[PDB]
Design a protein around this ligand. Structure first.
Ligand SMILES: OCCCc1nc(-c2ccc(F)cc2)c(-c2ccnc3[nH]c(-c4ccccc4)cc23)[nH]1
Ligand SMILES: OCCCc1nc(-c2ccc(F)cc2)c(-c2ccnc3[nH]c(-c4ccccc4)cc23)[nH]1
Ligand SMILES: [Cl-]
Ligand SMILES: [Cl-]
Lengths: 294, 308
């Protein structure tokens, strides 16, 4: 209601493109509150095709739901601007998306980070589940890095507004059936994405042939750094019987346990030389760019 | 201890001058975290020459205190660079200081904001008093706008850090804020919470006059004489007598009869609920506070911290 601000083209400007796709283009932007002389960095996602007035109201309705997600591991939609292209505005996450982060910091990301990112991502998903929301498009590309210690799931509602075949539960490929437990399936691909430092899933497989290899019992290979304990949890996220997959509350518990003995569950060369931020460095991050409570 | 990050010149850079005061120059800078790529905007303050140098440890000793202040209405020092100069790092506030803000928005700021800014400043000072700390240099210039709805007191502890004696107690531009100082503080270099309440008085008067220069036309060196003779800042035109009497009580010679910040909070909070009864601003009825939509937006974008 008062969670979504309707903006006007006149009061903000796009500065530089950040990322592309098809559905929308992402820009870094500047918000200029009227009557003021300050320029506030924002993230702007402008969507592909123009919409009629009645489509706009279906979008605006959904925007409100997006604007109500209040959890330190899910991005909240802050605002919206509607013309022929519609623009989504939210806080600017300067570190970008977590897929790219792990690829660029491939080998030199410690085990505490990886397992802690698994906790945060599950905590955010479990929040959506508690509110009976279903994401439909969890993947490493859809997790944003606020600070290296603080990641947020993004793009809730965008997939539900308008195909990521290699992240989808089997039931969703064959029957377009989306649930909380189908979200658990993609969560497991996402973890797999992190543990391989952003390898592409089913590399060497047509997207058209994924449902058959899944029916024949094929799953994504164990990552070299993952112990069997972690790989079994991923493998449990990909079971055919959706209801046998773990629930997010359990994944938070399980990964949290592992985050407490990180070098027992992930084997990374040089892990001992990669430590987690001190109390000092982490107060500094929070005071500067990450003041929200957790 | 861990509240104060110690930086090296390698991991941050000054990119733009934001303004110069008697204690030094503020730059917008960039922190570059180790092994990362991103550039994080920050505020950097390079301090001027400090009278009676206290090595580095005594400096760090005060920096840690400045790093300890944890309140929605006082700026915490985040880190420091000790080298050929002393460089303070804190969170960037793009709106800048409240003295510049009320001037550039003179006659377009309603009573709601003015009275709310005074509540927040007194809450800031009340916290310092509660922590047994004295600011020594409260002024409109030393209040930053985080958002128009949210102000914070800055430069805590820089007066005690740099000190600055000599003729600056007679000049009008130096480290000593004569025209904000309590008479006891001008005469005997005495600083308490109650002299802080004198500067609060003057701070509020700058707010209510939309940025006027206090005792304008009177030389700083002459201030302690006119105060001894009963002269005080005059009633701002938008102030009912209720408000002016609070200002004038802040400026009584007997520090013990001045009000205490905790009372200031309650009295300015009471006036904020009926703001047009206490400030007479023309067009006030058409100057409103922000909507919940607007504040939620500011909060989620720029201002995620606690705050009443
Ligand atoms: O990733 C999902 C689809 C792409 C995307 N869509 C969005 C999105 C934006 C506004 C909104 F209202 C809803 C969704 C983002 C995005 C969001 C916030 N901060 C951000 N920084 C960078 C960033 C920083 C540095 C280098 C490269 C990218 C992106 C982003 N990316
Ligand atoms: O008495 C002097 C008060 C000056 C001051 N000192 C500081 C200060 C900085 C670092 C530190 F460690 C301690 C104090 C600031 C300041 C702080 C944060 N953001 C800021 N933006 C602008 C700003 C923005 C736009 C246009 C003009 C000014 C200032 C500022 N201003
Ligand atoms: Cl896209
Ligand atoms: Cl200064």
């Amino acid at each position: 209601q008062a969670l979504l601000r309707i903006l006007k083209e006149t009061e903000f400007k796009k500065i530089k493109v950040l990322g592309s796709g098809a559905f929308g283009t992402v820009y870094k932007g500047l918000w200029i509150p009227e009557g003021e002389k300050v320029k506030i960095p924002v993230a702007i996602k402008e969507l592909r095709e123009a919409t009629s007035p009645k489509a706009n109201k279906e979008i605006l309705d959904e925007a409100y739901v997006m604007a109500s997600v209040d959890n330190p591991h899910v991005c909240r939609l802050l605002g919206i601007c509607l013309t022929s292209t519609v623009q989504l505005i939210m806080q600017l996450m300067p570190f970008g998306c977590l897929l790219d982060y792990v690829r660029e910091h491939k080998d030199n990301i410690g085990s505490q980070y990886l397992l802690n990112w698994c906790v945060q991502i599950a905590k955010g998903m479990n929040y959506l589940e508690d509110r009976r929301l279903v994401h439909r498009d969890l993947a490493a590309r859809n997790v944003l890095v606020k600070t290296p210690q603080h990641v947020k799931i993004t793009d809730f509602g965008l997939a539900k507004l308008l195909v990521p075949i290699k992240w989808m539960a089997l039931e969703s490929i064959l029957h377009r059936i989306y649930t909380h437990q189908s979200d658990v399936w993609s969560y497991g691909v996402t973890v797999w994405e992190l543990m391989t430092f952003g390898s592409k899933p089913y590399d060497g497989i047509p997207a058209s042939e994924i449902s058959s290899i899944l029916e024949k019992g094929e799953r994504l290979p164990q990552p070299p750094i993952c112990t069997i304990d972690v790989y079994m949890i991923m493998r449990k996220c990909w079971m055919i019987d959706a209801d046998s997959r773990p629930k997010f509350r359990e994944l938070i518990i399980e990964f949290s346990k592992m985050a407490r003995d990180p070098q027992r569950y992930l084997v990374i060369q040089g892990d001992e030389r990669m430590h987690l931020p001190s109390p000092t460095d982490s107060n500094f991050y929070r005071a500067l760019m990450d003041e929200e409570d957790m």
